[PDB]
Symmetry: D2
Subunit: 321 residues, 4 copies
């Protein structure tokens, strides 16, 4: 149930904040050039191309109730993203896995936002031969779980708008399956949502089709069928878990081109991302979605998603010692 | 004169190199939270939104022969970029000017690449009211002049391609008049150019029109008339200087939609940006541009652009 | 003041409507291969490439109160469209205008919809040399004045929507300054407007900018300044007349890129085309434009536009004997 | 065996030519308002919206060696196209099939190009209720088989270019799965190919991906795998047959987004459409495709495609009495 899941998070959260006075990693821990530092003290070289030209890729696994969730899927996506950008994970994947879990155990964080960043390094791409672009930089940090939609808002649903002043960066400019931090369009959508009195922007592809929002995939529900865009979006691990939950309940999920018009004619809407999970949308463009309540299929997806966090096929326990 | 301008630069480079053993700022100086540090030692907070989400704007003025070139145009464009992104220059504009001048003077660099970065700060835009987004961060650094085209290549021109695996980010996603560091498409084009045996990628808008390249504007020349794209590109200060020079010489500049086909049927091609100046392109898609030599109008713009660096209306001397 | 012009047309309508029994051309007259036939009896070859592949351009001048309005501008734009499409007006422009006034004369129509069509001919472009594509076909007809907005609606303003299920054909696909009959996107927009309970669709370029609608240009007014898109649209003769009226009245004109958001924050909206003239819009997306009344700048352009039809510099009288 | 197919076609061509003196339908037959006329005498009303605004859909089945090829697949696609455009086939599809067979038998054409056109009718969409737009018009005609690539050129393959002055109309403007005659972009591409010394234009989607050409789908072959675009194109019946032949031969076909770069790195290229069949491309942008010869996998698809014309699951024999 939703109340039991959030009550456990609130308990573990309070325990974490009580440890902050004696554990300098309780607010987060970062890995910078082989050194573990408190997150809010972490610094990176100004000349790092991940800053100078956002020449990087990244990925965000999570920890819930002391259990890493689908970590191997995120590490595999990071490696695929690195290869698409001609980057290379600077450490063996097995060592990265050991460092990540050790950082979580040192922080004591039971519900964690985990981020890995692989940047081009100190040498820019311009005027460089491929041989001198191999010293890629790696940054990792753990921090308390981040909510794109706060737990209280998940009980009643959120408000969204179809963005009309900004469209998603097309794949011909930037591959949206390569997770990146070049959030120019998404930051614009967030400003438009604030100007229009809503919280979440839904960005189109400029061809009257839905893509994704500012840090989440979009799923529409109409007549017992789930619809989510197949192109122009990140292939989210949460979205993959949504498909797993729907298949277990005999619910069809159509991963295809989704017209904007369907968002106005569907029964339920919810957002999905690692930093938040399953987040219902009960208002669109100032009007309620159907009856303005969290739909029944959304709760089924919501309940199943968090149940997967204790399935040993998708999670493993962390030894905090 | 190309040889005269470059010979002066190489001579000043020897002076800078000889000073490096006793000046820790000779390789660059950075301004971080009110502190001046050697550029290669400068560090920024990991949680800065300029890194966490590239939530920033920036601008790049330059120094040549100890003269700041068109600094007030770059400072004004940075302020216009900040307002468009709901950022604000964290220091008064005049105070920023004196810091940059003092930074250049401390470094001893006579030909300088100067960069100013304004990021959102330590708090992200997501789930935030406008009041908690006013603590923007400022980063500035001086570094030796950066060449998108090396001086020796400018004498003969470079090789370019029309990018076919990537197109420019449309203005409906990111305003290209707001200078930003989200170079996803530009970095892809640089890889495609390397894959195809050329140096400079020319990105289209996907609608079969030219836009800009990986850090430079594009100007085509046909029958004595300059053509440069009017939308989907940065309004470069170098491009504005090109128009200034062509204005003084009676050369018509057409800032309009430029179709891709014109790049294959023009007489001269050259790029322009602060990090390099006027850079001729004598080869396109593996084929020569006209006669494969640097064109006469390009040389006219070239000579006029560098003479502008000693015009008091566009520059001022730095007291080292 | 609308009444004088409308009553003139309404009274001239009765003279034409009462002459329907006697006049075989009161409902229209067409020019097909050198012969003149009643409009609703005209026929074209099935193999004409103007039908087989919409391989044509066209233009619509008009007659008002027995005065051809800016006919030479429409003829020049037609010749420009032909050259851009590698077509050629199959008769000297001088013979075309003489044939045109003769057709209006025999029809007796005082307020007429005139349409010229130049098609590729009977031979298709596919697998053909340039020399085999020179026999272009010409089709011309006169028709009673067509209103994209009824005169009664023009006094109160109409309802419009920003199309969300369709966007305008980009110039890189089809040159919108070459007037064509490939209305696939405009027809979809008209269906969307009917679906959403409005009359007129406003199509975007997919990049959150305004373009044009189904057969008209769009003009926005805010703080006494006219705004109309500068690309991706037809350079309409009515729009050029709107700008001309603005020149004579000291109005600032901004022919530039108009973002979609300006339509939701402007003071007045009106559309313009030869088939209807100046056509106000007082409702957008189900909400009133400003105060929902025909704004003062629109009424100013409206009165000036129809006064040009009696200006000898822009019109000339037809001799009906 | 390309000779076996082409020689049989030439023998039937000689028989049809000798009958042209006595048969007025040997050059084609058209169905216009229930009347059968010689194709080159067929006329349509000028005011038909299929001409006035290209407000129509169409489809092209074919006859080979006296056998209709996949006719019901074309009729089903025609019905799906009509429904998407809010049109309706003006006759029962079984009667339409009976009429088509009767026209082919009456013409004596053994290898035929068959075209069916459904237009909006005489009343335009602009300012109309759904009731007044139900009188759709139907045009059908038979004519000798049309070759987008001549049989002799199919032996050595043709030359193509990636169009750089034009891009395909995006689906947000016009649905490419709805076969239409609004060939504005395709005609421009055909002119660019002629300007650049090539025969066939390959149009991109504007996002550095391949779509289709001027009346054909595009298939790339690399390392034994077939690639063809999954969006922005017509879902061709010939393309469907290509997938059928490749599946019967254990050859993988990937219907997915195809980057432009793959066209410059692949082993074989061929086009496919009803009017011509499998058409190899051995030159791209003035350079040979691999060795410049018709590839082995292309010939395998070529042989299987024509063998399908005698498979009872994809063809049926016409009784010419
Ligand atoms: Cl609490
Ligand atoms: Cl994202
Ligand atoms: Cl986030
Ligand atoms: Cl299905
Ligand atoms: Cl649906
Ligand atoms: Cl376990
Ligand atoms: Cl354990
Ligand atoms: Cl000097
Ligand atoms: Cl003229
Ligand atoms: Cl033909
Ligand atoms: Cl269509
Ligand atoms: Cl849009
Ligand atoms: Cl109309
Ligand atoms: Cl019109
Ligand atoms: Cl009279
Ligand atoms: Cl043979
Ligand atoms: Cl009409
Ligand atoms: Cl027989
Ligand atoms: Cl029926
Ligand atoms: Cl070429
Ligand atoms: Cl699609
Ligand atoms: Cl298919
Ligand atoms: Cl590839
Ligand atoms: Cl069957
Ligand atoms: Cl069958
Ligand atoms: Cl048979
Ligand atoms: Na959008």
């Amino acid at each position: 149930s939703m109340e039991k899941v959030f009550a456990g998070y609130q308990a573990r959260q309070a325990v974490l904040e009580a440890s902050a006075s004696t554990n300098p990693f309780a607010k987060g821990i970062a890995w910078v050039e082989g050194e573990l530092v408190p997150l809010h003290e972490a610094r990176i070289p100004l000349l790092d191309q991940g800053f100078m030209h956002s020449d990087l890729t990244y990925d965000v696994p999570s920890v819930w109730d002391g259990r890493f969730f689908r970590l191997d899927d995120h590490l595999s996506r990071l490696e695929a993203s690195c290869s698409k950008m001609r980057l290379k994970l600077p450490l063996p994947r097995e060592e990265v896995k050991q460092i990540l879990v050790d950082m979580v155990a040192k922080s004591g964080i039971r519900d964690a936002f985990v981020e890995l960043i692989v940047t081009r390094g100190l040498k820019g791409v311009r005027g460089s031969k491929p041989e001198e672009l191999v010293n890629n930089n790696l940054y990792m940090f753990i921090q308390p779980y981040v909510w794109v939609m706060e737990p209280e808002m998940q009980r009643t649903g959120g408000s969204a708008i179809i963005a009309r002043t900004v469209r998603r960066v097309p794949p011909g400019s930037m591959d949206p399956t390569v997770k990146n931090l070049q959030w120019g369009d998404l930051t614009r959508g967030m400003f438009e949502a604030s100007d229009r009195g809503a919280t979440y922007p839904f960005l189109t592809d400029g061809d009257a089709n839905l893509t994704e929002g500012s840090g989440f995939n979009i799923v529409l529900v109409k007549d017992g069928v789930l619809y989510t865009p197949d192109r122009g979006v990140l292939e989210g691990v949460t979205r993959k878990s949504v498909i797993d939950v729907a298949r277990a309940n005999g619910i069809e999920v159509r991963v295809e081109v989704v017209p904007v018009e369907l968002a106005y004619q569907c029964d339920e809407i919810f957002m999905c991302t690692t930093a938040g999970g399953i987040m219902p949308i009960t208002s669109l463009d100032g009007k309620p979605v159907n009856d303005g309540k969290v739909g029944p299929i959304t709760k089924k997806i919501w309940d199943g998603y968090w149940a997967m966090h204790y399935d040993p096929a998708y999670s493993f326990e962390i030894d905090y010692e």
